[PDB]
Write a protein that binds this DNA or RNA. Structure first.
Ligand SMILES: [Mg+2]
Ligand SMILES: [Mg+2]
Ligand SMILES: [Mg+2]
Ligand SMILES: [Mg+2]
Ligand SMILES: [Mg+2]
Ligand SMILES: [Mg+2]
Ligand SMILES: [Mg+2]
Ligand SMILES: [Mg+2]
Ligand SMILES: [Mg+2]
Ligand SMILES: [Mg+2]
Ligand SMILES: [Mg+2]
Ligand SMILES: [Mg+2]
Ligand SMILES: [Mg+2]
Ligand SMILES: [Mg+2]
Ligand SMILES: [Mg+2]
Ligand SMILES: [Mg+2]
Ligand SMILES: [Mg+2]
Ligand SMILES: [Mg+2]
Ligand SMILES: [Mg+2]
Ligand SMILES: [Mg+2]
Ligand SMILES: [Mg+2]
Ligand SMILES: [Mg+2]
Ligand SMILES: [Mg+2]
Ligand SMILES: [Mg+2]
Ligand SMILES: [Mg+2]
Ligand SMILES: [Mg+2]
Ligand SMILES: [Mg+2]
Ligand SMILES: [Mg+2]
Ligand SMILES: [Mg+2]
Ligand SMILES: [Mg+2]
Ligand SMILES: [Mg+2]
Ligand SMILES: [Mg+2]
Ligand SMILES: [Mg+2]
Ligand SMILES: [Mg+2]
Ligand SMILES: [Mg+2]
Ligand SMILES: [Mg+2]
Ligand SMILES: [Mg+2]
Ligand SMILES: [Mg+2]
Ligand SMILES: [Mg+2]
Ligand SMILES: [Mg+2]
Ligand SMILES: [Mg+2]
Ligand SMILES: [Mg+2]
Ligand SMILES: [Mg+2]
Ligand SMILES: [Mg+2]
Ligand SMILES: [Mg+2]
Ligand SMILES: [Mg+2]
Ligand SMILES: [Mg+2]
Ligand SMILES: [Mg+2]
Ligand SMILES: [Mg+2]
Ligand SMILES: [Mg+2]
Ligand SMILES: [Mg+2]
Ligand SMILES: [Mg+2]
Ligand SMILES: [Mg+2]
Ligand SMILES: [Mg+2]
Ligand SMILES: [Mg+2]
Ligand SMILES: [Mg+2]
Lengths: 75, 133, 154
RNA sequence: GUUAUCCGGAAUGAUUGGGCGUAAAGCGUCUGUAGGUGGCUUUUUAAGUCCGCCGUCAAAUCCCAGGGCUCAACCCUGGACAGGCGGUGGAAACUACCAAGCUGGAGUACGGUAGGGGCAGAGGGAAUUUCCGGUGGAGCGGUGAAAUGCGUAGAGAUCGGAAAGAACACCAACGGCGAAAGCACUCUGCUGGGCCGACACUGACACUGAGAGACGAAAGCUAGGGGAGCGAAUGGGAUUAGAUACCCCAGUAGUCCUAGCCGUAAACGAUGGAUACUAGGCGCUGUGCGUAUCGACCCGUGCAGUGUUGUAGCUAACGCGUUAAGUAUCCC
């Protein structure tokens, strides 16, 4: 189904699992074990976005405009 | 695997110290060349190539044990010089020679890889890959 | 040649039980040398034991036509490290006590050496032996590599 | 000769040329920004790199070759290696760049499976203490030996009742998971990872990390609850020359819960992280394959982690030894 390994799909899967985890981080704030993971995964997504910005500018800007991902910290 | 050259060199050193004739190394232009040279110098018995799952392995036969495994007067030493952190280059007149020439020095130059002997004949300097005792 | 005379001690309920340890090297000054260590109550006897222990431990140093080393070499024994390098004829033997006596007794005429690491006489002797034992003479590297002498000369 | 100054020896600030298990030395543990290094194949470019030629880097000094003061010191002539910077002509292996490729590195999907991983919500039993009764009727308790203490206002003992808090026997193991700290009566819910088998897919997306962030035993503190046992402090009894201690009798903070702060420990493997490569023997946990039977073993094996002896090699010695303190590369 499309490319399940593609940059844009992976970044989507990460963004979605993150917004899913935000709800559990809210209901129980005292779970740090979970948050440590959230930080890891958010780190991966950030990584791929940076890589993707290096490789192709158009696909990148399209993607972070599309999935509502915040603009990058290189500015 | 930040450095492939040093890795080949290292696997050789390890197989050698353990008194084993046979080594598997991963091939590459550099690897292959280096091994060729190693053969025409006479530091290594024989080399050959293998292929599986699009991986290339040069296996290297090594010079036999010295008149037993226990009483060894001689080992075979390898030393990385120019490494990713510090690249060592030399002009024609700084080209190193090992132990008065008994060993050799490997150079990567404009005309390809060679020994210091070839560099001296042709008058070229370059990047020093390693020393070999 | 007596390198070192020390008074070691074992202690017993009576008191201090005194011995002498002698480190001694033997050579012909002709290219044959060895180290030995001995222990006794008297200076003389330990000297003697040292002599025998050395004689049965003995080896040969590879030499060059000018009475010097084939090449530059390091060595390691305990905390003693030893640096030898060949010299031009007429430079004499320049080195420190253990290394210098060993080399001088081997008959090496021109040699550079420096012991790095530790200072202990004995260990430095043994390290020197380790050095000059691993020395490869050109004929033999020609034979090992399987290449004519004149080709490696260049 | 003495004193002062500088380099040496000093490898004693180490590029050449050191270290960090116990000698001085690994941040408590992760996440990650700059920064540094970064797999293979083909092409490009020529910034480094390499070779040739030119300009210059004043003379004096140092180096080499002669000459002159009777010699030398000193003076004079001629010449040059280094090494630096700039221009130009070439070379294209390595780093760097440009264009396209490739999976074994790193990930995504799929399908499995173990688990005291974390947070939250239910439930459970011993035991202990106190309270309310019935019996009973002199000592209980405690120490090396005693005494304080509790007891005829009925103690302790024993049976029946209530109430409360805290901790979870056996399982438990030289076992499991966690980044570390830590995590175990039972259950359910929300959720983090890990590993394994398949090509299903992307195609270097990697490794580390100055600053910065988050977590971080116990004690401690702020605010509100809660308070059985234990117990700093405190008090009494002894012991002792003395006893502001060890022992005993009581017992306040605190230990618990909620919301915070503190940020330290022998936070220890006294061992930073990643990768590659180097005998085995005996073990265990999770899985996969073949065999055994057609389901439990069983065997042989593939991985992933975990433990004990030990070859090479290392080490000052002890010891470490595929989970290195071995052989190499990179970062802190
Ligand atoms: Mg240069
Ligand atoms: Mg004896
Ligand atoms: Mg050492
Ligand atoms: Mg010294
Ligand atoms: Mg004077
Ligand atoms: Mg110095
Ligand atoms: Mg100092
Ligand atoms: Mg040191
Ligand atoms: Mg200590
Ligand atoms: Mg220490
Ligand atoms: Mg640590
Ligand atoms: Mg520490
Ligand atoms: Mg800190
Ligand atoms: Mg990191
Ligand atoms: Mg980065
Ligand atoms: Mg780069
Ligand atoms: Mg490369
Ligand atoms: Mg000048
Ligand atoms: Mg002159
Ligand atoms: Mg004259
Ligand atoms: Mg001049
Ligand atoms: Mg110049
Ligand atoms: Mg130039
Ligand atoms: Mg090229
Ligand atoms: Mg590319
Ligand atoms: Mg709970
Ligand atoms: Mg009950
Ligand atoms: Mg009665
Ligand atoms: Mg009383
Ligand atoms: Mg009353
Ligand atoms: Mg009564
Ligand atoms: Mg009672
Ligand atoms: Mg209750
Ligand atoms: Mg674990
Ligand atoms: Mg516990
Ligand atoms: Mg789970
Ligand atoms: Mg493709
Ligand atoms: Mg830091
Ligand atoms: Mg905190
Ligand atoms: Mg506390
Ligand atoms: Mg206080
Ligand atoms: Mg309070
Ligand atoms: Mg109380
Ligand atoms: Mg008490
Ligand atoms: Mg008191
Ligand atoms: Mg009171
Ligand atoms: Mg008193
Ligand atoms: Mg009490
Ligand atoms: Mg709290
Ligand atoms: Mg500390
Ligand atoms: Mg601990
Ligand atoms: Mg069995
Ligand atoms: Mg393993
Ligand atoms: Mg062990
Ligand atoms: Mg062991
Ligand atoms: Mg060590």
């Amino acid at each position: 189904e499309e490319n399940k390994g593609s940059v844009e799909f992976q970044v989507f899967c990460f963004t979605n699992k993150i917004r899913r985890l935000t709800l559990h981080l809210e209901l129980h704030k005292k779970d740090y074990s979970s948050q440590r993971g959230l930080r890891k995964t958010l780190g991966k997504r950030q990584r791929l976005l940076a890589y993707l910005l290096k490789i192709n500018g158009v696909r990148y800007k399209e993607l972070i405009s599309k999935l509502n991902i915040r603009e990058l910290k290189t500015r | 695997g930040k450095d492939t050259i040093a890795d080949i060199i290292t696997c050789i050193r390890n197989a050698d110290m353990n008194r084993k004739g046979t080594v598997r190394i991963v091939s590459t232009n550099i690897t292959e060349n280096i091994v060729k040279i190693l053969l025409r110098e006479g530091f290594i018995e024989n080399a050959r190539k293998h292929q599986e799952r699009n991986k290339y392995f040069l296996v290297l036969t090594l010079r036999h044990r010295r008149n037993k495994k226990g009483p060894y007067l001689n080992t075979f030493h390898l030393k990385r010089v120019s490494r990713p952190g510090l690249r060592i280059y030399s002009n024609y007149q700084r080209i190193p020679r090992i132990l008065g020439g008994m060993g050799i020095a490997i150079l990567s130059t404009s005309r390809g890889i060679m020994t210091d002997r070839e560099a001296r004949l042709e008058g070229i300097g370059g990047e020093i890959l390693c020393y070999i005792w | 040649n007596v390198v070192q005379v020390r008074r070691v001690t074992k202690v017993v309920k009576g008191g201090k039980h005194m011995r002498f340890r002698a480190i001694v090297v033997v050579g012909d000054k002709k290219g044959q040398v060895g180290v030995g260590v001995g222990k006794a109550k008297e200076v003389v006897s330990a000297v003697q034991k040292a002599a025998v222990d050395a004689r049965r431990n003995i080896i040969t140093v590879p030499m060059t036509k000018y009475l010097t080393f084939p090449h530059r070499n390091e060595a390691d024994y305990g905390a003693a490290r030893v640096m030898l390098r060949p010299a031009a004829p007429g430079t004499g033997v320049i080195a420190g006590g253990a290394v210098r006596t060993v080399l001088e007794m081997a008959g090496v005429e021109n040699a550079l050496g420096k012991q790095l690491g530790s200072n202990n006489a004995l260990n430095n002797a043994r390290a020197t032996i380790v050095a000059v034992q691993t020395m490869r003479q050109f004929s033999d590297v020609a034979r090992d590599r399987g290449i004519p002498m004149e080709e490696l000369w260049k």
